[PDB]
């Protein structure tokens, strides 16, 4: 009917980018003016409220996304038609595109924004505005999206339904293993290494699990294997050459 | 002699040499010359160079062309590492002895543990004579006198060379008894048991027993000689 | 009809759209992993101009930056023969870094761009990609390619940092322009003692600090290039495990 | 005619010549690898007689010397059943070291041989080879053979270094003959503080320093012997890869 | 015609040994008398000239040897006769014998000669006479010989022509990785460690690639596999026993 | 007849007896390995009540204790589906430690039990085992299970060490009861400087030392849990090698 739909990907991209742009404007306005001092009540009013509303909301969102994708799964996935299988592969690629955008927003934008924020304050607490935005919003958001991408493939595409793709597992967990370094950082940023030396091996736990973001290589390679198999002998050599 | 390549500010802000003198410019083999001077430790010791808390006085020369018989710093005989306090001045003197004929540039040098070498003034020393005429000599606690130029080398040779010969003989014995290609083919053809199997193991055990006996005999014999030795100071 | 597509035009359009989606999907999150790794290992040397010294910076940054370039080269070249993997990773890193420098370091915290600009890596990445392209082997591009990856770091970065090595006199004491910028625009948790820069040493035989660092960084890089090429190969696995 | 040789005599002559060529070919470059490794890991302890202390030297040298002995044993025994592998490596190392001491340390720089003589390893190598020969398993010779490799180091080196441990009195201070030799023949870049020798310690219980060190090197060798036996197995691979 | 020729091996051994003996005599004569101070013009006359001549000469020699061996290759390497394959294997063994001699000269003789030179001078520069002889002559020489040895097998023997022998690659590259810490020792000798301690981790990268000299084990084993396969059923048992 | 057993009852009795024997056989020697590892890595933190601080103890102990729990979980769950592997390891460690504390630390050396009692681990082990039971995958219990393993360490140990954190005044100086017990009952080789406890830092923010340490220790454990699950899988190998 229409293999390339793309409406879902556009909706997700617009929603995510607009939400992150709103968050960036909010923290531009309130980084100072009740953002610096962590003991003032205005900090609780403007920043701790976000922290308290983040974890339950994203936890519920991820669990509900997994449950919805599991209850919406087809029980005859082996009988999918080549056209429907290609459509599902395209939807998986859309999921992965949204996932990559979320990964850029969290692991790249806000993570290095923490770098410039650490040069503005003297670390009044662990729950700085940058920490609230980065550790407790963006990282959970992209891990939730990875869960959605992982569970869509598990429940729609027969190749990912008959087992667990190791690369998909890595790209779903290891990037979710970047938020974990909240302890490795805070405990590291108190006992062992003694300054905002980002180079310190208190942050090398961040790095090792940051390498797992490369697991998308195997995921897209499996997707391409499926695509190249779905197109018949006519598709590969007559058209694609 | 390589002090030119060292960084300028480190050279001028670590050690300030003065009153450096060389007793003789031309020396003969087995003739003693004294290199003495005073050194000032800069108060603003650079962060790059570690503290002079652990340092060693040395004579900067191209190898042992001059044998150091004794050296003093801070009114102390200093064959080992010494401590230099920042901001203090110390007097040093090195008793050298001509060994190799030629014209050599001999420096005064102090090495800091975490910094490296600091090279002081250097003077050209002309050495006349022949190398084979060189004798130290030194006296032992028992009163006997030995020549450090040649002492102990004969024993080291007599212990090392025979063992190297024994190892070579072992290798050649096993190489001629069983060929390399022959034994490789034999092992690859499943039969890696007729390549090595008693009486071969008997020869091996005889060699091991003889080696252990020689080691024990050698250890005991070299304990009769030099019955009183001390660890490195 | 060309299954599973209705017509040839539909197949071509689908292929083009999926190509664009795959390109974006890889470029992002390769940017993500590479930016995380570079941020938390390579410093904090890319953050501050007063950290871009002659010894540590051209040593640390190329060695730690060649990693995802090698991984992306392993992914692209082995599976697509596309010779832009190292350029892919370097462009992603530079795009993310420049965006956040302008938006967060300068846009948010009002740190001048002259203080927080990153280090250029496009030239070494192009060298690496072409060496892999002219050759066909990662072994060759590991050695000659990554050796040039280090030797090209300082020369391609000098045009951007030369203006900040101009000497100025402050209260009877010589300081560089970069030192002055770092000292003027106050950073709270960044003292001078932490800078981890070339502070001198009794055996630095002058006029060759940068060449020595470049050869060290570039020629150590082949160990890192090998390790990360094979790590990218492992990350490209299609293995499906039966249970978790 | 025995293919691909014309006659039996030609085949035998070819086999003998190639056997000699292979023996030289391996002995050299096993010498090379072993000498590089020992020189840059095991010191600088073999270099100087005043470095051959009672604790660090008999610990460091056997542990880092058993490596190529185990690797060469793995090569020779598994593929040829020839029981000279550890003796092979040790003899190569000692021949190279002695040649370089006599030609360069003494022939070039005129350091007396009493200062620069190396440490004997032939006896522990023979012990290791025979233990591998009487047994048939590398597991046994890893435990008992390499245990004797450590315990036999000092006793077999005592005949060559005891003469230099005689006490002498220098300016009201006790010094060994080895210390005097190191102090007399000046080395530029070799201060006393770097010697990394036994300088005393508050929980050494006298008259057992050498037995404690020798045993310590005895079983740390077993771990190193195991690892390097398997590394020699890996280096003996015949794997051919399709693309590099 | 003649399986064992050995003229090439004898010529190579004689040439290499005579050249290295000449170099040793030259550095005996000129180690002092313009070999100590690196800033004197006589050092440029007697030592820097060698450095400037070395690198282009050995680069040209290695590239030309590889090109000659590649252009002289047979295009029907499979149709080699057993006797000609024995001759080629013997020539390869001659190549590897010369390679082992060169490795001894470089990795063992001059590498530890640098050890005794370090106790004679205070390291006026990185381009000491010992460094010139060791780093820039002997290491490139034996890597060039390895390249010739590696390319001869690739271009004359079908077993090494159908792919890349992993052990041969190691024995050709890893010992060619015995030069790298000229950057790394010097940077180590100028930044990390302070004194001329050969036990420095700055010399440990020298070691990890010095282990690659053990790659000759696999090369010799493959050569022996080829030899044992070529000798017929009568050769293995009836003759060799 | 049910071969190789004569009758049904004989087979049942044999199976029951062998089940008991296997249970004892594993419980011991898992106690052995776990106790050696925990004693020689995790201290010396279980040994002394004055070592059980708020930062180092709840960090070191859970991380090094999750090891054998994960390995035994890998053994039991994969091969038997029995959900007590972590409880198996923890109970073994606790039983051995308590036996040694009472019989030797108190029975032999007369150190009071209040000084030498170990840290509780049954609650985190139960949490880990149940999480592995409700789930069926080691990946989930690696993350959620081992996260609760560390976060539960301090709360389940607080009832035991709270009484020793009561403040006391000694010669015009504040001391804890744990410090007093460590000070009153003299230990020869335990100076105060060795204690390796939370001594404060300029970036400790008030009232969150324990939550930070528990999150660090507990959430790192997934790396250790993964590594040791797979190491227990490797130790569960049935491979038979042809030669040694
Ligand atoms: C955070 C934005 C993620 C956007 C990812 C994307 O492009 O795919 C979204 C996908 C695109 O649509 P598709 O999976 O093709 O069809 C959606 C309808 N179901 C789930 C019945 C197949 O729709 C969904 O949101 C999946 C269901 C979860 C929300 C209730
Ligand atoms: C291994 C058989 C040959 C040596 C037998 C012997 O009497 O030596 C043991 C003795 C044991 O040391 P000890 O007598 O306690 O102290 C002697 C110390 N030195 C050798 C420096 C005088 O010397 C050693 O230190 C050699 C290393 C241990 C081999 C078992
Ligand atoms: C560490 C070895 C790297 C070079 C690979 C090799 O062993 O060379 C043989 C190889 C044989 O592979 P080939 O059939 O040429 O297929 C590879 C195709 N290219 C050349 C485009 C990579 O050709 C090359 O890649 C380089 C030849 C240079 C000689 C001066
Ligand atoms: C790599 C080709 C482009 C650069 C060529 C050039 O003239 O630069 C070499 C020169 C060599 O350093 P030198 O002239 O000894 O000292 C100049 C040091 N700076 C650049 C800090 C003034 O500058 C560098 O330090 C760049 C890194 C080495 C590339 C081979
Ligand atoms: C010049 C060395 C080439 C080694 C090629 C090879 O077969 O790889 C070795 C091994 C086996 O590779 P395999 O899985 O068989 O895949 C061979 C095909 N490539 C080379 C494209 C991955 O892979 C690794 O684990 C890498 C070890 C070094 C970096 C830590
Ligand atoms: C007595 C312990 C034997 C351990 C070796 C083994 O069983 O094989 C496992 C693995 C795979 O070997 P595989 O491919 O099965 O080849 C068998 C031949 N050996 C026994 C020489 C490895 O071997 C290794 O790579 C060495 C591991 C221990 C040192 C770190
Ligand atoms: C580095 C010395 C190696 C000595 C060992 C050996 O047998 O190899 C020498 C090789 C033995 O001859 P081979 O390679 O078997 O080739 C014989 C037939 N031709 C000369 C026509 C290729 O002869 C050459 O010197 C060939 C020319 C190389 C420089 C461009
Ligand atoms: C890092 C992934 C961990 C979860 C495994 C997974 O990919 O989920 C699919 C899997 C499919 O395996 P299944 O057929 O359910 O068999 C495993 C049986 N249990 C659930 C008892 C472990 O179901 C689960 O174990 C968890 C599902 C939770 C969704 C909200
Ligand atoms: C895990 C459920 C049982 C404990 C619930 C509780 O109230 O404890 C949390 C509280 C959090 O610490 P806080 O009240 O900030 O400081 C109390 C510090 N102590 C216990 C040393 C007085 O105590 C802890 O330190 C236990 C470790 C964290 C478990 C989530
Ligand atoms: C979320 C990661 C799942 C990894 C599952 C897997 O296939 O195991 C990885 C690797 C490859 O699997 P393989 O050896 O083929 O054996 C598959 C069977 N299990 C899963 C029990 C190892 O096995 C290991 O040796 C463990 C490495 C990590 C700990 C240091
Ligand atoms: C495709 C690139 C091939 C590189 C071949 C290198 C041949 C050896 C050169 C040795 C120079 C010293
Ligand atoms: C048996 C294992 C149950 C695992 C439940 C998975 C829930 C996924 C939530 C994702 C939140 C980011
Ligand atoms: C390592 C290079 C440092 C500069 C030394 C002087 C010029 C060298 C010419 C090759
Ligand atoms: C981060 C890399 C870990 C290894 C990836 C999976 C390896 C698959 C082996 C076939
Ligand atoms: C076995 C007899 C021990 C003799 C006294 C102690 C010597 C040190 C051995 C470790
Ligand atoms: C230096 C040793 C590296 C590994 C050698 C190759 C291993 C082959 C595995 C079959
Ligand atoms: C989530 C509420 C945090 C309360 C104050 C900070 C305590 C330390 C937690 C890391
Ligand atoms: C201590 C664990 C070492 C590895 C166990 C054996 C691995 C078997 C691989 C199949
Ligand atoms: Cu932060
Ligand atoms: Cu001079
Ligand atoms: Cu050197």
Tokens found for residue F215: 């999150």
Q: How far is CA B29 from CA B65, B67, B95, B100, B127, in A?
A: 10, 10, 14, 7, 7
Tokens found for residue E125: 């520069």
**Partner A contacted by F140 (CB < 8 A):** no
Q: How far is CA D162 from CA A204, D166, D185, in A?
A: 50, 7, 19
Cβ atoms of residues E206 and C223 within 8 Å: no
Query: How many angstroms separate the CA atoms of F208 and F220, rounded?
Result: 18
Q: How far is CA E172 from CA B62, E167, E168, in A?
A: 37, 8, 6
Q: Residue A162: list chain C partners with CB under 8 A.
A: 240
Count CB-CB contacts under 10 A for residue E229: 13
Q: Do D191 and B211 touch (CB under 8 A)?
A: no
Show Cβ contacts of residue D93 under 8 Å, excluding neighbours closer than 6 positions.
D31, D34, D35, D38, D65, D68, D121
H or E stretch including D181?
Answer: helix D177-184
Q: Which of A61, A63, A169, A175 to mutate to test the pocket of ligand 12 (most atoms within 8 A of CB)?
A: A63
**Ligand 11 center to residue E74 CA distance, Å?**
20
3-state secondary structure of C151: helix
Q: Is the CB of F134 within 6 Å of ligand 8?
A: no
Q: How far is CA C196 from CA A199, C54, D7, F113, in A?
A: 10, 11, 73, 50
Tokens found for residue E161: 């022509």
Query: How many angstroms separate the CA atoms of D232 and C44, rounded?
Result: 42
Strands B66-73, B76-77: pairing is antiparallel
Tokens found for residue D180: 């005097």
Show Cβ contacts of residue A119 under 8 Å, excluding neighbours closer than 6 positions.
A196, C109, C111, C187, C188, C189, C190
**Partner B contacted by D22 (CB < 8 A):** yes
Q: Is the CB of C227 within 6 Å of ligand 5?
A: yes
Torsion angle of C-alpha atoms B7, B12, B14, B20, degrees rounded to 10: 120
Give the residue from F59, F168, F180, F56 showing the smallest Cα distance to F114. Answer: F180
Q: Taking the CA of residue D239 as centre, how many other CA atoms within 13 Å lie in the half-sphere pointing to its CB? A: 13
Which of A210, A220, A230 is opposite residue C36, by nearest beta carbon?
A: A210
- Judge if the upstream peptide bond of residue C44 is cis by omega within 30 degrees of 0: yes
Count CB-CB contacts under 10 A for residue A178: 30
The ligand placed nearest to the CA atom of residue C210 is 4
Strands (E), C17-141: none
Let me know if B132 is exposed, middle or buried by CB neighbors in 10 A (0-12, 13-18, 19+). Answer: exposed
Output the DSSP codes for B82-142: B---TT-EEEEEEEEEE-S-EEEEEEEEEEETTTEEEEEEEEEEEEES-GGG----EE-TT
Q: Which of C230, C232, C234 to mutate to test the pocket of ligand 5 (most atoms within 8 A of CB)?
A: C230
Let me know if E33 is exposed, middle or buried by CB neighbors in 10 A (0-12, 13-18, 19+). Answer: exposed
Query: Which experiment gave this structure?
Result: cryo-EM
3-state secondary structure of C153: helix
Let me know if A16 is exposed, middle or buried by CB neighbors in 10 A (0-12, 13-18, 19+). Answer: middle
Q: Do E213 and D108 touch (CB under 8 A)?
A: no
Tokens found for residue D140: 């046994």
Query: How many angstroms separate the CA atoms of A225 and A231, rounded?
Result: 10
Cβ atoms of residues E27 and E35 within 8 Å: yes
3-state secondary structure of D112: coil
Per-window interface: B 111-170 vs E, CB < 8 A: 111-117, 119
**Ligand 8 center to residue A136 CA distance, Å?**
25
Q: Do D33 and E83 touch (CB under 8 A)?
A: no
Using CB atoms, which chains have 3+ pairs under 8 A with A? Answer: C, F
3-state secondary structure of C241: strand
Query: How many angstroms separate the CA atoms of F91 and F120, rounded?
Result: 10
Query: How many angstroms separate the CA atoms of C53 and C119, rounded?
Result: 12
**Ligand 15 center to residue B222 CA distance, Å?**
22
Torsion angle of C-alpha atoms B49, B51, B55, B59, degrees rounded to 10: 40
Per-domain boundaries in chain B: 1-135+233-233, 136-232
Count CB-CB contacts under 10 A for residue D98: 18
Query: How many angstroms separate the CA atoms of C91 and C125, rounded?
Result: 9
Per-domain boundaries in chain E: 1-241
Query: How many angstroms separate the CA atoms of B101 and B28, rounded?
Result: 8
Q: Whose CA is nearest to atom 5 of ligand 17?
A: F208
User: How does DSSP classify residue C44?
Assistant: T
**Ligand 14 center to residue B126 CA distance, Å?**
68
Q: Which residue do the tokens 């990693």 mark?
A: C67
Cβ atoms of residues D112 and D187 within 8 Å: no
Give the residue from A175, A49, A170 showing the smallest Cα distance to A111. Answer: A175
Query: How far E117 CA lies from chain B's nearest CA (Å)?
Result: 9
Query: How many angstroms separate the CA atoms of E92 and E9, rounded?
Result: 10
Show Cβ contacts of residue E145 under 8 Å, excluding neighbours closer than 6 positions.
E95, E98, E99, E102
Give the residue from C86, C178, C191 showing the smallest Cα distance to C131. Answer: C86
How many Å from the N-terminal Cα to the C-terminal Cα in chain D? 41
Rg over CA atoms, chain D: 21
Q: Which residue do the tokens 């324990």 mark?
A: F210
Query: How many angstroms separate the CA atoms of D194 and D191, rounded?
Result: 6
Show Cβ contacts of residue D221 under 8 Å, excluding neighbours closer than 6 positions.
D62, D63, D66, D146, D147, D149, D150
Cβ atoms of residues F127 and F143 within 8 Å: no
Measured in angstroms, the resolution is 2.4
B104, closest residue in chain E (CA to CA): E32
Query: How many angstroms separate the CA atoms of D23 and B172, rounded?
Result: 10
Count CB-CB contacts under 10 A for residue E2: 12
Cβ atoms of residues C146 and C121 within 8 Å: no
């Amino acid at each position: 009917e229409s293999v390339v739909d793309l409406r879902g990907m556009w909706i997700g991209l617009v929603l995510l980018n607009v939400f992150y742009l709103i968050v960036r404007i909010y923290e531009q306005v309130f980084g100072w003016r009740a953002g610096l001092d962590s003991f003032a009540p205005e900090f609780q009013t403007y920043w701790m409220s976000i922290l308290w509303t983040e974890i339950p909301l994203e936890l519920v969102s991820g669990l509900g996304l997994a449950g919805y994708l599991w209850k919406t799964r087809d029980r005859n996935v082996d009988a999918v038609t080549p056209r429907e299988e290609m459509r599902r592969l395209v939807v998986l690629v859309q999921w992965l595109v949204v996932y990559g955008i979320a990964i850029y927003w969290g692991a790249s934008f806000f993570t290095e924004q923490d770098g410039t924020w650490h040069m503005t304050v003297i670390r009044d607490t662990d729950f700085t505005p940058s920490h609230i935005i980065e550790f407790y919003m963006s990282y959970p958001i992209y891990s939730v999206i990875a869960v959605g991408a992982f569970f869509y493939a598990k429940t729609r595409i027969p190749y990912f339904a008959h087992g667990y793709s190791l690369a998909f597992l890595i790209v779903a967990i290891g990037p979710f293993m970047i938020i974990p370094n909240v302890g490795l950082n805070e405990w590291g940023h108190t006992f062992w290494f003694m300054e905002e030396l980002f180079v310190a091996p208190l942050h090398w736990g961040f790095v090792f699990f940051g390498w797992m973001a490369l697991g998308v290589f195997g995921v897209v390679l499996q997707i391409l294997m499926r695509i190249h198999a779905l197109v018949g002998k006519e598709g590969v050599k007559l058209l694609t050459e | 002699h390589g002090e030119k390549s060292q960084q300028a500010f480190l050279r001028m802000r670590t050690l300030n040499w003065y009153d450096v003198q060389w007793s003789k410019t031309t020396v003969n083999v087995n003739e003693e010359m004294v290199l003495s001077g005073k050194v000032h430790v800069f108060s603003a010791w650079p962060q790059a160079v570690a503290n002079p808390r652990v340092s060693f006085l040395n004579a900067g020369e191209p190898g042992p062309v001059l044998v150091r018989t004794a050296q003093f710093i801070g009114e102390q005989f200093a064959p080992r590492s010494v401590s230099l306090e920042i901001g203090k001045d110390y007097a040093f003197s090195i008793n050298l002895r001509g060994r190799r004929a030629g014209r050599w540039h001999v420096h005064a040098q102090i090495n800091v543990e975490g910094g490296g070498p600091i090279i002081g003034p250097g003077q050209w020393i002309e050495i006349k004579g022949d190398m084979k005429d060189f004798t130290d000599p030194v006296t032992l606690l028992d009163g006997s006198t030995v020549d450090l130029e040649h002492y102990g080398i004969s024993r080291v040779y007599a212990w090392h060379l025979p063992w190297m010969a024994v190892g070579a003989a072992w290798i050649f014995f096993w190489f001629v008894r069983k060929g390399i290609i022959t034994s490789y083919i034999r092992v690859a053809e499943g039969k890696a048991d007729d390549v090595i199997g008693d009486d071969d193991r008997r020869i091996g055990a005889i060699v091991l027993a003889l080696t252990i006996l020689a080691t024990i005999v050698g250890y005991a014999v070299t304990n009769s000689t030099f019955p009183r030795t001390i660890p490195l100071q | 009809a060309v299954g599973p597509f209705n017509s040839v035009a539909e197949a071509a359009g689908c292929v083009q759209t999926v190509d664009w989606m795959l390109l974006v999907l890889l470029f992002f999150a390769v940017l993500g992993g590479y930016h995380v790794h570079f941020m938390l290992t390579a410093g904090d040397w890319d953050f501050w101009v007063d950290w871009k010294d002659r010894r540590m910076w051209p040593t640390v940054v190329p060695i730690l930056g060649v990693t995802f370039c090698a991984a992306s080269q392993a992914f692209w070249w082995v599976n697509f023969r596309l010779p832009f993997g190292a350029v892919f990773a370097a462009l992603g890193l530079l795009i993310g870094e420049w965006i956040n420098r302008y938006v967060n370091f300068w846009g948010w915290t009002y740190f001048p761009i002259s203080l927080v600009f990153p280090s250029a890596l496009i030239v070494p990445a192009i060298w690496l990609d072409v060496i892999l392209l002219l050759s066909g082997s990662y072994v060759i591009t590991a050695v000659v390619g990554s050796l040039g990856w280090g030797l090209l770091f300082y020369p391609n970065n000098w045009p951007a940092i030369a203006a900040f090595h101009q000497a100025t006199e402050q209260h009877g004491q010589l300081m560089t322009l970069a030192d002055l910028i770092g000292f003027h625009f106050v950073r709270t948790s960044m003292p001078e003692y932490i800078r981890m820069v070339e502070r001198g040493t009794l055996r630095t035989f002058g006029k060759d600090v940068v060449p020595v660092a470049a050869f060290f960084s570039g020629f150590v890089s082949m160990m890192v290039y090998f390790l990360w090429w094979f790590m990218g190969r492992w990350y490209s696995t299609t293995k499906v495990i039966d249970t978790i």
